[model samples]
Target chain A: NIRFSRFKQIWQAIEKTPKSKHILLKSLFLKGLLTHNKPLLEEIIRQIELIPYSSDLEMLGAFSQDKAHPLSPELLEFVQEMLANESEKVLLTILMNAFQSIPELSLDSKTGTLSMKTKKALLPLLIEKVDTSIAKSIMSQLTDISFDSVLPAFRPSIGDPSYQKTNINLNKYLSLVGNKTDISEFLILTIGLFTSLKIGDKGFLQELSADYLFVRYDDCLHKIIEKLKEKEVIEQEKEVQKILEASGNLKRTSNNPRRFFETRLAQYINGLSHSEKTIEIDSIDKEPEDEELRDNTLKACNKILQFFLGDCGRVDTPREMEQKICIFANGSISGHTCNIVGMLAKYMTEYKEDLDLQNDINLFLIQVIGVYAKRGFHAMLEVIDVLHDPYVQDIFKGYGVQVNLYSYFKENPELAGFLQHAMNDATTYTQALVNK
Target chain B: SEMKIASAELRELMKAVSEGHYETVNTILDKDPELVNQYAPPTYDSPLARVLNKKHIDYKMLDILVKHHVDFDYPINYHKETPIELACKNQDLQLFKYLVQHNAPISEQAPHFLLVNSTNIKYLTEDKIKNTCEIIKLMGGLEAVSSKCDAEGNRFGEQARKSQLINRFGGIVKYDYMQLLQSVYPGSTEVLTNLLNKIRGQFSSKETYDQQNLKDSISLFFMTGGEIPPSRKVPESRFEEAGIDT
Candidate 1:
C-alpha cells in the first residue's frame, strides 16, 4: 500500500527529470511515467540508453535499493506496455536490468499476487518479443509469474522467439509434426519464436512445474502438427504450381533444391578456372550431365545432410538465428558430431551405427568410382567434390575437400596401369597450370 | 582372401602425404619426381591436393610440391579450386600471398565470397574479413564484382564489398534455414516441397524401421529367453544400483 502510494506519486512526477543518475530511481521514474506518459518515458529512456550496456544490472546493489516493496501496478503496466509494443531497446534493457530488488521494480523475484488479466497479457508479449533471452533473463529473476498463465502461450502460432530459440527444438518439433511440408517462412518464423517458450529457465518451472510445461508443450506441439496437417497439402501443391509453369517448363526453376545446390557449386567451381566461364565435368556412363550431375550429387549430399542433422526426442514444439552459435561456441545436441569428420572418411558411418546409409554410401561409392575408374576420372572427382562439401562446411567453409581415390579404385581389377595414367594426367594438369 | 590393392606405390605416396610423414613424402618425391604430380586416379587428388586438403596446412610439404614443379592452379578437386583459391577460402593472408608471390594466377576469377567474407566463408572471424578483403584487393578480386540499388551505375560502390557482407552476413542475421534448405533433392523433376517431402519420408521411415527393429528384436529376445545380448555398458566391477526386486 505504501509502495503503491509512492508509485502513484512517482508516476505523477514530471516537469523535471530527477538529477541523481541512480539507475534504479531513474528506472523507477521511467516506468512509472510510462504508465500513461509516452513522450516523457521516451526522453528518459533515450538518455539512459547512453549509459552503456551491462552498466545498470550491478547498480541494483550499488545505491539505495528496496526488497521489501512489491512491484506496484504502475510499473507492471509499464512492463506490460513495453512487452506489447514493438519498441526500441532501452526501456526493455532498463526493465531487464532492474529485475533484481531495485527502487524501480521492487523484488519482482518475490512476486506479489500476480494479476491474471495483466499477467496473461504480459506472458504473450514476453513470448512474442524477438529477444526472448531478455524474457528468459527477466523470467529467471521473477518468481511470481504463474506457470498456468504462461503455459498456454507455447502454442505454434506464437513465434519461436525466432531461432537461437530453435536448433534442437526443430529436430523434435518436426519429428512430431511428421508432415515436413507444413514448413513455410511464416511457419518457420513462428516455430522459431514459439519453441523456446516450451521449457522455462527453472524460475517458473522448477520441479512439478517442469513436468507439465514440457508434457503440455508436447500436447501443444501435437495440436500445431494437426493444424498444419489440415491446411498444408493444398498450399504445398499450390507452391509447386508456382514453381512450374503452365507449359510445364522448369524455366520456372528458381528455388529448386538441386538448382540451389548446383548454383552454389557452379558459383564455387566456375570461379576456379583460367577465366570465368562454365566448366563441365565429362561424365562417361557413370554420372549425369553437369546440372543433373550436381542434382544427383546434392541428392547424396542432402540425404547425408539428413543423417547429419538427425538424432533426437519428446518435443511438443521446435539457433535460432546464427549469432548464438558464435557466442556460445559451446555445444548443442544438434551441433555437428564426430560423424562430420567421419562422414568425410572413405567409410561413411561412424558411431558405427549398424543400419542403412553406410551400405548405401559404400555401394554408391564403389559403383560410381569403380565404373569411373575403368571409364573416366573427372566424373567421379566431381561427385567426390559435391558429396564432400557438407563436412567441409562443417568445419571450414572456404577449405578444400580430400577425396581418396585409392579407396574407390583399389578393387578395380584393371589393377595395374593405375599409377602410369594417374601421374600422366597429374603431370599434364600441372603442366597445363603453367600453360598459356 | 588377402585384401588386394594394386597401386601400392601410389598408395604409399598419397598415404605419406595424408599421414604428414614429411620425410617419407620427401623420399617418395625424391625417388620419383613424377610422383609429385602423381594424383589419385579419377579424383585428381594430387600430393599437393592431399597436403592442402589437410586441416593443418603443412607449408613445408607445399614447399616440396612447388619445388618438384607441382602446379598450384591444377584443378585438383572437382570444383577446379586451385591452391590459391583454397588459400583465399582459408582467409590465410600468408598463404594467399605465398601463392600469389609464387605466380599462381587469379586468372580464374577470385572466389566471390573472398571479396567480402561470408558466414558461408567458414572459420570466419574478426581478423579474417579485413585480411580476406586485403588479399582480394591485392589481386584485383575487389573490383571484379559490382552491384548496387541494384546497380544504379555503381553509385553506392564505396562499401560495395563491405556493405553486402554486412547486408548478407550481419544484421539480425536471419536464420532463414527453411529458405536455405527449402527442399531436399527428391529425384522427381516436380520438386520444391515434394523434394524435401520424400526425404522426410526416408528419414522417418528408416528411423521408424530402426526403432521397430531394435524393439522387436529386444522384445523377442526377452520373450524367447535367448542369451543376453552384448551390452557395451554392462554393470560390473563395483556396486551397480540394485533394484529391490533383484
Candidate 2:
C-alpha cells in the first residue's frame, strides 16, 4: 500500500494544470488522485492552493459521499468549513454531485441506507437551499425521523399545491408502519389541516380503515362522519339560500331567524324524521281554534290508512302493510293510534257517505278494535271516539265473532258494559247503515 | 233413581273441586268415578273446568282428577280454553309442566291464538321469557305452534302483527329460537344459554349453518347497541380428523 511515490507525482501534476479545465481536473482527481490511497488524500488537502481551484472542492464532495469512509473525517471537517462561506447554490451542487456515485440514492425507496446522523448534519442546510421537489424527495426518503423532525421545516409550505402529494406519500408510510397510536396522532393533525381546507373525501379518509384503526378507534370514524355531516349541513344551507334568493322569500335576520328552515333542513338533508313539536289541544269535545291542524292531522291518518289498504304504490310487501297496522296498534310512536281513532271518529260522524274509503277505513278500524280489546279498555278509550261507528259494530258482529270476542266479552261483564255503551251510542248510526 | 243420585253426586264433586276441597274431592270422585269426566254448570259444566279458574291451582285436586281419568281436554267456557290452555293463560309454569309431564292433550290452536293475541298475560319479566315458549316447547315445539300459525293463511288481527313472535315459535331460523325463548320466558337465560350451547355443539361439526342468516338473526335478536356477539371459531379438534388446521 505504499503508493506514496505515485501519489506525490499526481499531486505535483495538479499544480501546473489550467483552472479553465476544472471539469478535466476534477475528473483527474476522481480517476487519478482520489484512490483508497490515504497519503494522496492528505497531500491533495495540503497542496490545495496549487491545484485547479475546483479540484480541491471536488475532492471534498467525493469524500463526503460515504460518511464512514476512511478519508471522510478530514474531508467532512473541511467541507463543513467550506459550506459556511459558500453560496446556497454551491452547497446544493455539492450534495447533488456527491450522491451521483451512489446509484441507490432515493427518497423512501428500499434500496438506499443513508444514516440519519449524516442527514441530521446535512439536511437542514440542504433543505434551506433545495427546491421543494428535491426537499420533498429528501424528506420522504428519510428513515426513523419523527414527524416533528421535518414538519417544522415544511409547515410553511403546507398551503402549497404539492402538499397533497406530500401528505399522501407520508400517509402511505405511516399506515404501513402499523403504530396505531402514531397514526392516531397523525389523524388529528390531518383532520385539523383538512378541516381548514374544507376537504372531506370519504375515499381519502377510507385509507385509515385498512388497519381497522377506524373500527377499533370509533372516534376516528366519528370524526369523519361529523365532518361529512357538517359539510352536508353547509351544502343544505347554501341550497336553501339559493332557493330563497330565486323565490324572493324572507331572509333569516337577527330578529326573525327561521326555525321552519332549520327543521326542514334537518329532515331533508339528514333524512331524519320530523321531530315532534308540542301543541296545545283544548279538548276533543270542543272545537279546535286551529282547524287546519285538525284537518292536517286527519289527512295524515287517512294517508296511513290508504298506505295499509294498498292505495299507495309503496306497500309492496305483506310485512310493510302489516307493519303499518302494528304501528297504529302498539307502536311506540306517541299518540299515533289515538290520532288514527280521532280521524276515524270524525269520518264516521261527518263523512259517512264516502263509500269509496269505507272499506279501507273499516279494515283499519277492525284491527285497532282488536288491538284495543287485547290491550285492555284503557287503550280502548284511546279509540273511544270511533268506538261508536256502525262500521265498528259491523266488524264486531262479523270478524269479532270469529275471534270469540262476543263470548270473551260476555265473560268479562265490565268489558261487555264498555262495548254496550259504545254500541248504544252507535244504534242510530247502525240503523242508518242498515237502511242504506 | 240412578240418574238422580248421579246428578246429586256430580254436583257435590264439582262443588268440592271448585272450592279446593281436596279431601272431599277425593271422597266424591272415589264414590262415583263416572262423575269425574262429566260437566258441571256455571259456564262449561265440568268439575275440571270449575277448578281451572284457580290462579294457584291445587295440583293435589288436579292429581285426584288425573288419577280418576278426568277430562283434561274439556274446553271451559266459550273461549274453549282447556285446563292446559288456562295454565298457559295464567302463566302457571308449574301447572303447565305438570300437565305436560302427565301427557295432557294440550289444545294447540286455541292456546296459540290466545297466547299470540292476549295482552292480559304479562309474561315479559326482567327482559327475558317468564311465560310462553317453554309451554310452547312442551306442546311439541315449533311444529306444533307453526301448524296453528300457518293455518288459516291470512290470520288477521293483532296476533298476526306480532309476526316476530309467531316467526320465532315457527322455528324459521336459529335466531328465532333465541327470541322465542327470550321473549316467552324472560329470565330463562340458563335455558337459552344451554340451548344455544347444544346448537353450537351440533352445528360445530357441520360448518354449513347459513352463517350470514344466523348472524343477522342473532344481531336482531340480541341488539343492545352496535356491539355484536363474539364470533365463535369451530374447535380445532373438529377439524383435526380432516387435517384442515385453519
Candidate 3:
C-alpha cells in the first residue's frame, strides 16, 4: 500500500513556519483533525509527528507573537518558498480530500470564523499559475460540500424542515440524471414537482404515478392491456376488427395525454361558474388523457380541496388571539370565530392576504376603510401592506374604491409622527380627493 | 348506421402505422383518437403503444367510440405489456403495484414452467423472472426436474441435482438486476418484487453497465450495533475503527 512513513518531519517543519503562517496552517490542520474519523486523524497526526525537529518546545514561541511582532513576515516567506517548489494542484487536492474527511471544519456561529476567510485573505498572494476558475470551482465545491455535510450533525438544530412549503428541490438526486439530452423535460418535471409541491406520505405516494417517474410509454402496451382487462375494459380485438373493417388500417392513442388534459382544463375553466369550477375537479381523476397522470392530478386536487375546506385548521388568529396564544395556541379558536373584526385586522392586515379565503376576500375592504380613522392610527398602517398587495389592489379597483390608502395614513398625527420618525423626512401630507 | 371507417382516415392511419409511421400516427391519434379511428382503420399500430399506459388521457375515444377501446389498462398485443407490466419493467413499482392493487392479474396457478435445451427452468407465479425460478425449484423436486427435462429435452435438462443447484447460481444474478434499486430504496419493494417475479424472463448471462452503475449506488447498511434507534453519539471506539468512505 502507498503510505507516508515520516510523521515527525512534518511536525517539526510546521512548527518552524512564521507566526501568521503558523496561525493559517493551524486553522487548516484543525479542519482536518477535529470531527473526523479518528483513525485517519491519528494516522495523519502520527505522520506529522515523525518529522525530526531541532526544538519542538521553542518552535511553539513563533505562533505566540502578537500583532506588533514581525515573526509572521518570515513565516509567510517560508510558506511562499514551499508553495513555489511544490505542485499546487496536487497539494490542493490532498488538502481538500483530507478536509472532506473532517466534519468539525464548519463556519457555524459557534466557530466564529472559518478557514474560508483565511483562504480569501491569502488570494492576492497566490500566483497566476493557478487559474482563477480552478480556484473558484474548488472553493465553491468545497464550501458547499463541507457546509451541507456538516450542517445537521454540527448545528444539530438549525433549519428545521419547512413544514408548510409543499415543494422541495432534491439537488443530490437530480445530479444523477442531469447529463442526459432529453433530461430537460425530466428536469422541468422534477423542478415543477419538487417546488410546486405538497407534503405528507399521501402526497409522495400519489406522485409515484407520474408518467415520467413511473410508467413509460415505449413497449408498455401489454401491461396497459392487462390492467384494462382487470378493470373489465378490452379493446384489442375490437380494435383489430375495426382495422380489418377499414380494410386493414387504424388510428392509435396520443403521446402526451397530460398536456391534453392541461389544455382541456384551461378551456373548461375559462367560463365555468364557481360550482361548475368545483365540479371540474372530477376531470383530474377521469381525464388526464392517459393512465400515468390520473393519480397525481387527483392527489393535487384533494390537497387543494383540503386547503379550501379549512380542513387543516385555521391559520388566522382571532383579534384577542395574542392574549390566548400562549395558553390556547392549539385550541379550536383560531381562524373561525364569531368576532370578525380582530381576525380581519390581525390576519388580513398583519400576515397580508397571502392566504385566500372567502371572508378575507370580502372583508378586506372594510379593514381598508377603518384605517382612515385617527383613533385607530396605530392599526391603520399595519393594514397598508395588504392594501398594497396586487390582488387586494385589483379587487379594490374592481369595486371602484380608489382611496389614497397611504395618504389616509399620512393624515393622522400619531401615525404620521410614527412614520416620520421611522423613515426621517416623511413627505408633508396634503389631503387629496376622498369620497367618504 | 354503423358506417365502415376501416377504409377511411382510420384505414389510412392503419396503413401508415403498418408502414411504420409512428410519429405521424401518434400526432393524429393525439389530437383525436376518434378522428384517427374514424378515418384510419384499427391495426396493431392503432394500439397506440406510446400512450397505452398513461392515465391522464381521456380514453373516451379509445374506450367508448372505437370498436376496440384502448383504456389505460388495455392489453398490449406487442411486448405482452399491460399498463402494470410497463410500470414494473421500467422499475416503477409504485405504478406497477397501483395497477396490480386495482386488479392487475397474476396467473392463479403458477408462472410457465418449461424445459428448453436440456434445462429445467421453473417460472413462478409472480412477474419477476428470477423469483419465479426460485419459487419453482423450492416446490418442484430437483430429481423430478432433472429427469423430466432430460427425458423431454436433453439439451436443457439439468444433468443432476448438482446442475439444478448450479443453475440457481445464475438465477441470483438475474434477481440482482431487478432488485438493485429496490434494495437501496425499499418504499415500493414488495409490490415491485411481486410484479418482477411474475413477468420474469429467462436469465441472460450478460451484465450491463446500468446494472453495475445501479449496484455502485447502494450503500451497505452500517449500524452502530446497539439498542433501538441506537445512540446519537458515535462512541470514541466506534469512530476510531469506522471505515471512512466505505
For lDDT, the strongest prediction is 2
lDDT of 3 at A264: 22
Q: Give per-model TM-scores.
A: 0.27, 0.25, 0.21
Interface RMSD of each: 29.0, 35.3, 26.5
lDDT digits (tens) for residues A1-436 of candidate 2: 1233333444345543323222222322332122232222332333333333344444434333343242344443433333343334333433433332122233533222244454455544435444566555555544323111100001101121111221322233223222222323333333333433435443333332221221234555445445544645445254323322322232112211112111111111111101111111122232222222222222323334433232221121112222345444431222545555544454344334323244335434433443333323234334433444455545434332222332333342223222222222222222222223
For all predictions, the C-alpha RMSD in Å is 30.1, 35.8, 28.9
- In model 1, chain B matches the true chain B with a TM-score of 0.52
Runs in model 2 deviating more than 4 A are A1-436, B1-6, B40-42, B110-122, B126-130, B154-246
lDDT of 3 at B75: 29
Docking verdict class for candidate 1: incorrect
Worst 10 residues of 3 chain A by lDDT: A426-435
Local lDDT at A363 for model 2: 37
**Model 2 lDDT on a 0 to 1 scale:** 0.36
Alpha-carbon lDDT, every model: 0.34, 0.36, 0.28
User: How close is chain A of candidate 3 to the true chain A, as a TM-score?
Assistant: 0.23
Candidate 2 local Cα displacement, residue A346, angstroms: 42
Model 1: per-residue lDDT, tens digit, A1-436? 4444432333334212222223333443432232222222323333332221222212211121232222234445443443444333443444432331112232433222223354444444543534566565544544333321100011111121210112323333333323322222112222322334342122221221121112233443344344334444334244323322211221212222222222222222211111101111122122111332232232233233223222110000000001111111211112222333334342242212323234334333322332222222233335445445565443322223323323323322221122222222222232222222
Residue A404 accuracy (lDDT) in model 1 = 39
